[PDB]
Design a protein around this ligand. Structure first.
Ligand SMILES: *[C@@H]1O[C@H](CO)[C@@H](O[C@@H]2O[C@H](CO)[C@@H](O[C@@H]3O[C@H](CO)[C@@H](O)[C@H](O[C@H]4O[C@H](CO)[C@@H](O)[C@H](O)[C@@H]4O[C@@H]4O[C@H](CO)[C@@H](O)[C@H](O)[C@H]4NC(C)=O)[C@@H]3O)[C@H](O)[C@H]2NC(C)=O)[C@H](O)[C@H]1NC(C)=O
Ligand SMILES: *[C@@H]1O[C@H](CO)[C@@H](O[C@@H]2O[C@H](CO)[C@@H](O[C@@H]3O[C@H](CO)[C@@H](O)[C@H](O[C@H]4O[C@H](CO)[C@@H](O)[C@H](O)[C@@H]4O)[C@@H]3O)[C@H](O)[C@H]2NC(C)=O)[C@H](O)[C@H]1NC(C)=O
Ligand SMILES: *[C@@H]1O[C@H](CO)[C@@H](O)[C@H](O)[C@H]1NC(C)=O
Ligand SMILES: *[C@@H]1O[C@H](CO)[C@@H](O)[C@H](O)[C@H]1NC(C)=O
Ligand SMILES: *[C@@H]1O[C@H](CO)[C@@H](O)[C@H](O)[C@H]1NC(C)=O
Ligand SMILES: *[C@@H]1O[C@H](CO)[C@@H](O)[C@H](O)[C@H]1NC(C)=O
Ligand SMILES: *[C@@H]1O[C@H](CO)[C@@H](O)[C@H](O)[C@H]1NC(C)=O
Ligand SMILES: *[C@@H]1O[C@H](CO)[C@@H](O)[C@H](O)[C@H]1NC(C)=O
Ligand SMILES: *[C@@H]1O[C@H](CO)[C@@H](O)[C@H](O)[C@H]1NC(C)=O
Ligand SMILES: *[C@@H]1O[C@H](CO)[C@@H](O)[C@H](O)[C@H]1NC(C)=O
Ligand SMILES: *[C@@H]1O[C@H](CO)[C@@H](O)[C@H](O)[C@H]1NC(C)=O
Ligand SMILES: *[C@@H]1O[C@H](CO)[C@@H](O)[C@H](O)[C@H]1NC(C)=O
Ligand SMILES: *[C@@H]1O[C@H](CO)[C@@H](O)[C@H](O)[C@H]1NC(C)=O
Ligand SMILES: *[C@@H]1O[C@H](CO)[C@@H](O)[C@H](O)[C@H]1NC(C)=O
Lengths: 137, 139, 363, 364
């Protein structure tokens, strides 16, 4: 069904805004609520986070800090019927990873280092031979 | 509802073990696993070789273990068990796996800066070793 | 008809005469027919003076046969009363001996009081079940009657009594649970609740008390979690994983452990009780211990530690450890094959260049 | 002729039935004429239920004018009687009111009977000073004379009586802190020590043959010492070193911290009481934590932890962690870094050969 389409992780740095979504199937007559759930077969009740903020079903969270992990679950019900609930989008956060020299990672620098070394050895032998053996004669 | 699966996200370090549990009732036959990377968008069947990925099954708890993980195991694993008495496929939403490296922030930064400092030196010396002898011999 | 023999001793003050004298009434009524033989045996010996056994008057009991009543009397002096003599009533009624042994002074027999525990309601048991029950437990009594565990509020009025008295125990240490109920707001207002216990063997009740402090401030805890030390693992016997809830106010933290998604039974871990922090003035700390086999910890088996405090922003938080308390950034970068190829190439390359260096030095 | 009003109560072992019930008798004889009325009362409330007043029958007398007799009875429940409530009976003879008290509270016996007990020497006292002693505490008594405490031996031998008697207790009582120095092996041998107390008022001695409770076998604890967690160190506020003892028997262990040789103040660490172990039989474990400033931890400062038990051979063991307890983070990280170090060395070592060869050829 549609209870499997949602991803399994989300990547954000602190202080930014994340984006979720819950793809409803009842024609704009349903109710969308967002919850935050514990491990699984939990005992503490889940908490009510926020309602559907815009018509298309998107939740936006700001002011990201260290204590904003955990599973986020969208629960939708149509009037008097039972609710339909996805199985969440785990959220993992850490800001730091830096810039330097984005062009290549360690997977490339070593290869061009070894190529440059072998080419330098190849090119630094002929000049000495030409300078030396062409002087005596 | 009928099929319960945990955990939802696992981020180990390269070399260790991972276990995934599918909880299901012991009425409708045996359980077969699936697999899905993010290059695909339709689950594939899972192969199995002994020593690596291995499966077992107790009364109402089926499990899978992988030994010595590596970078080619970053997919979502699904457990599926169709009823042989009603003919309806029931499927959980599975697990996720990530494989972390051996380094930290501090070591990486130093290694990168040292490597770049070395990498410019060979360029400078190759330029010198190609420019000096030609200027000397050409007279 | 065998009657009910009862003897009604006077109180100590009710004396009259010089020397002062009082009386005993050995009223054993509800019997038929008329025949009766009453012997007021003081110290097992009958008294010939002052024993006034009146006539056997017919008890006009309309329901059934008309029975008969008797009214025995005996007088003793002040010194006789305090002489601790056994003024036993032995009535040879209808050829049958009925004996009733009683004292002759104010003797609550004799001295036995044990314990009573009043347990207040915690906070986790209000948010979960929405019922602020409060019990006070009486321990290691005898399964006799006349036990009355009664809660009273601060205004003298009472609330409901108990149920579910426990069963027999090997040491005859039975117990009772005086559960009651109260609206949450009244308990939160913080008034003193007292529970009273009475017994046939108790010279006086046992007024306990329980109330809630008012005016405490809120601080949030900081749960850390440590793995077993290497010296323990080298034994290949067991391991202990400890949570640590440090620096919270007020008391009553609530913790539990989970594994595989299924919570563990309460017979594994051993939680502690809050006690004051050494350097901080008004904060506490707690603990928890989980014992697992050593082979279990060596093949994965991630564990968790759920706590719940009333000052936390969302009332719950959760930590975890498996064996690899590691795994920082750089999943795919840093290389693993280039680092071998480069090392091999530059181990070969310098050795090759040394030959050219030797030839150059030769020329 | 006013009657002689009397009140009688039943003994505590006189209640029967379900619910258990008894009776009270209010009797007043020797009155004339027959005009008489009787009313029962319950702390100001009159209850008519269970009231059986007899007819005014003439008393059987041999001489003088013939008077009359009357008997009144009341029924009560036991839970009311045991709750310390007061019942009174009132008799109205010729319009004259006579009231009499009755209650189940004639317990008190004001005498010198007081609680006399003792506190055994804990293991902290004996290990610190080798000063095995025992204390016989006396309360519920005020200032008297000849209040002599004798720590009688098995056969009542010599005893050094207590000194430095305190002031009057705030109860209006007096606290006699008995004390007597004692040998060592006698207490471990299960010998009878009674502090017989002599008094001027009641010289009855309350004897308690206290001794060592022979019992549980001997086990030795083992100390595992834990450095602070990383996420605490990141806070840069404080650290909490933990000393852990497990699997000892019996209870009463003694632990104290110490660095550089001199002990830390007893106001710096907190030690919990022994608690049972959930798996084994009645063996215990205890935890002691010390809170240091994080700046001190980044220099050195061993912080040894010293325990002291009974079954332990030398009665003292030490543990030590300063800053190096990472403990085999992995088996491949060190190889990875070693390989990188070799490659980095060989790069700069290789460049020298090229430079030297080229310059030597040029300079020939
Ligand atoms: C023969 O066998 C029977 C069968 O077990 C034994 O009966 C046991 O008797 C024990 C007597 O101590 C009972 O233990 C008590 O009851 C509770 C179980 O542990 C416990 O609540 C009691 O602990 C109180 O005492 C501590 C020490 O004084 C206090 O410091 C502590 O605060 C406890 O008081 C309350 O404790 C509860 C915890 O449940 C807290 O929530 C409250 O906040 C505390 N309030 C206060 C004011 O302190 C104590 O251990 C035991 O229950 C009972 N077994 C049963 C009923 O099954 C006989 O003893 C045995 N005969 C022998 C050995 O001679
Ligand atoms: C008069 O006021 C004084 C204070 O000015 C008060 O003195 C103290 O009373 C306590 C309580 O009775 C005494 O404590 C007793 O003795 C030791 C001392 O540590 C305690 O361990 C005892 O506790 C055990 O016994 C209790 C009763 O059996 C148990 O309930 C308990 O769990 C323990 O097993 C016991 O409480 C204390 O010794 C005195 N102080 C001195 C210096 O003696 C005194 O009680 C007041 N008197 C009256 C009649 O109120
Ligand atoms: C939504 O999905 C359900 C299947 O669970 C399907 O029956 C329904 O038709 C879908 N709604 C729309 C609008 O496609
Ligand atoms: C949707 O849910 C919220 C809270 O769950 C409720 O307040 C609201 O009335 C609901 N809307 C409808 C249309 O039922
Ligand atoms: C765990 O889940 C099962 C069903 O999978 C359920 O029967 C059980 O009650 C749950 N555990 C608890 C403590 O409720
Ligand atoms: C909002 O939902 C609509 C579907 O109704 C979709 O077309 C649109 O792309 C969505 N917007 C965002 C920002 O996801
Ligand atoms: C992030 O912000 C929230 C609310 O402002 C706060 O409760 C939390 O402690 C913050 N996180 C950190 C690490 O300070
Ligand atoms: C709606 O649900 C309620 C249960 O709260 C039920 O009593 C009622 O009959 C339902 N009505 C319809 C139309 O389904
Ligand atoms: C699992 O069940 C199937 C279906 O009955 C049967 O082949 C066998 O019991 C199991 N299959 C295995 C062990 O390959
Ligand atoms: C299945 O679980 C039970 C626990 O009730 C255990 O006793 C049994 O050994 C397990 N079976 C296997 C094959 O591990
Ligand atoms: C007193 O009488 C009771 C009658 O039940 C008897 O059990 C008890 O042994 C008697 N005691 C003495 C000292 O005569
Ligand atoms: C004990 O308490 C439970 C729950 O309050 C109740 O259901 C039960 O009936 C009680 N026991 C008795 C004997 O009434
Ligand atoms: C009986 O007791 C009451 C108090 O309850 C007291 O006022 C009254 O004086 C007592 N009766 C006599 C005769 O003293
Ligand atoms: C007796 O008490 C005094 C203080 O009143 C104290 O100085 C002295 O050391 C005590 N003596 C003993 C032997 O404890």
């Amino acid at each position: 069904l549609w209870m499997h389409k949602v991803p399994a992780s989300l990547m954000v740095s602190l202080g930014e805004d994340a984006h979720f979504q819950c793809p409803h199937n009842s024609s704009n007559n349903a109710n969308v609520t967002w919850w935050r759930v514990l491990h699984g077969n939990y005992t503490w009740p889940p908490e009510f986070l926020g309602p559907g903020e815009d018509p298309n079903g998107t939740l936006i969270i700001q002011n990201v800090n260290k204590s904003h992990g955990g599973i986020y679950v969208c629960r939708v019900q149509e009037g008097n019927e039972s609710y339909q609930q996805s199985c969440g989008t785990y959220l993992r956060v850490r800001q730091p990873p830096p810039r330097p020299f984005l062009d290549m990672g360690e997977g490339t620098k070593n290869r061009i280092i070894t190529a440059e070394g072998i080419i330098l050895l190849f090119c630094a032998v002929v000049p000495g031979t030409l300078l030396l053996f062409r002087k005596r004669w | 509802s009928r099929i319960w699966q945990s955990p939802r996200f696992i981020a180990r370090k390269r070399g260790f073990t991972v276990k995934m549990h599918c909880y299901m009732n012991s009425a409708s036959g045996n359980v077969s696993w699936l697999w899905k990377q993010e290059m695909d968008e339709n689950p594939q069947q899972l192969k199995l070789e002994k020593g690596r990925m291995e499966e077992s099954q107790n009364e109402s708890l089926a499990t899978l273990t992988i030994q010595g993980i590596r970078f080619e195991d970053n997919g979502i694993y699904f457990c599926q068990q169709k009823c042989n008495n009603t003919s309806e496929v029931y499927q959980g939403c599975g697990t996720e796996l990530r494989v972390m490296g051996f380094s930290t922030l501090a070591q990486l930064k130093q290694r990168n800066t040292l490597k770049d400092g070395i990498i410019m030196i060979q360029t400078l010396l190759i330029i010198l070793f190609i420019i000096v002898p030609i200027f000397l011999l050409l007279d | 008809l065998p009657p009910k023999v009862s003897v009604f001793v006077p109180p100590r003050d009710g004396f009259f005469g010089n020397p002062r004298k009082s009386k005993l009434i050995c009223q054993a009524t509800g019997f038929s027919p008329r025949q009766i033989q009453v012997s007021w045996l003081r110290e097992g010996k009958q008294v010939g003076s002052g024993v006034t056994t009146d006539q056997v008057q017919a008890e006009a009991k309309e329901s059934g046969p008309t029975t008969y009543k008797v009214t025995s009397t005996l007088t003793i002096k002040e010194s006789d009363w305090l002489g601790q003599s056994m003024f036993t009533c032995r009535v040879d009624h209808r050829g049958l001996t009925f004996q009733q042994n009683a004292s002759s002074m104010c003797v609550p027999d004799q001295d036995t009081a044990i314990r009573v525990f009043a347990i207040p309601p915690s906070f986790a048991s209000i948010f979960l079940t929405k019922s602020t029950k409060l019990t006070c437990l009486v321990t290691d009594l005898t399964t006799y009657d006349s036990v009355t565990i009664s809660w009273t509020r601060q205004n003298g009025e009472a609330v409901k009594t108990h149920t579910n008295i426990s069963e027999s125990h090997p040491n005859a240490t039975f117990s009772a649970v005086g559960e009651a109920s109260i609206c949450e707001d009244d308990w939160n207002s913080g008034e003193r609740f007292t529970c009273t216990v009475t017994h046939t063997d108790l010279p006086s009740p046992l007024k306990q008390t329980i109330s809630r402090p008012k005016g405490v401030a809120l601080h949030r805890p900081d749960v850390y979690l440590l793995p077993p030390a290497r010296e323990q693992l080298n034994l290949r016997e067991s391991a202990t994983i400890t949570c640590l809830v440090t620096g919270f106010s007020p008391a009553d933290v609530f913790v539990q452990w989970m594994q595989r998604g299924q919570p563990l039974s309460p017979e594994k871990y051993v939680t502690s009780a809050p006690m004051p922090e050494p350097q901080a003035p008004g904060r506490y700390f707690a603990h928890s211990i989980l014992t697992v086999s050593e082979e279990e910890w060596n093949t994965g088996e991630t564990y968790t530690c759920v706590v719940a405090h009333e000052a936390l922003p969302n009332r719950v938080t959760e930590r975890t450890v498996d064996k690899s308390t590691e795994g920082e950034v750089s999943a795919d970068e840093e290389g693993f094959e280039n680092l071998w190829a480069t090392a091999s190439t530059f181990i070969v390359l310098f050795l090759l260049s040394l030959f050219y260096s030797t030839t150059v030095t030769l020329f």
